[PDB]
């Protein structure tokens, strides 16, 4: 859980993060597990340089129509 | 209102041709100035009943049917901002007048308020009228803009 939370945090903050620093950032022990975990999260491993990359209502129409309805229903 | 002359000497019988076998004729009331020229003295009045037809009343409605290509037509988007700014300034002035109205109303007796706002702008109905008019215009503008932005594309 700690590792996946840290992965979620790192997916948005760092850009072009070297894998050597990732190995210690994610609290891992050996590089192979770091690469496997990165592949699980679908991060590219180009030259060990991970590049993360990566309903309510209709606007205008619904609001304006509802304002009109509220104005004219009570009249 | 149609008319038809009285007979002649039926006034000797005083029975001008009128048999009130129905209330449908007595409901109408003779006019005041018409009696001055003489209504029941020379020409008994008649009733008037415009009879329509479904075809005619259906389609005389067309006098108040706008052109189809005018609903989605937004007007120039500079007047719709000058009008808003002018309405807001008028609202500010009318609100100030409303404040002074409320201040002055504290020491007035009803026999004046019944006739106070006869000759001067009542700064309340102006506020309500401006609010309603600008809100209606604004809602129509918003709906037209959004509808065309979505459907036209």
Swiss-Prot record, chain A:
Source superkingdom: Eukaryota
Protein family: Belongs to the proteasome subunit S14 family.
Other comment: Present with 9890 molecules/cell in log phase SD medium.
Functional note: Acts as a regulatory subunit of the 26S proteasome which is involved in the ATP-dependent degradation of ubiquitinated proteins. Necessary for activation of the CDC28 kinase.
The protein, known as: 26S proteasome regulatory subunit RPN12
Species per Swiss-Prot/TrEMBL record: Saccharomyces cerevisiae (strain ATCC 204508 / S288c) (Baker's yeast)
Gene designation per UniProt: RPN12
Range of the intact protein held here: 184 to 274 of 274
Curated annotation (Swiss-Prot), chain B:
A GO CC term assigned to this protein in UniProt: mitochondrion
Lineage: superkingdom: Eukaryota
Coiled coil location: none
Reactions it catalyzes: Thiol-dependent hydrolysis of ester, thioester, amide, peptide and isopeptide bonds formed by the C-terminal Gly of ubiquitin (a 76-residue protein attached to proteins as an intracellular targeting signal)
Disulfide bonds: none
Gene Ontology molecular function, alphabetical: cysteine-type deubiquitinase activity; metal ion binding; metal-dependent deubiquitinase activity; metallopeptidase activity; proteasome binding
The protein's Enzyme Commission number: 3.4.19.12
Domain notes: The JAMM motif is required for the deubiquitination and degradation of ubiquitinated substrates.
Name of the protein: Ubiquitin carboxyl-terminal hydrolase RPN11
Biological source species: Saccharomyces cerevisiae (strain ATCC 204508 / S288c) (Baker's yeast)
Shown chain mapped onto the complete sequence: 154 to 306 of 306
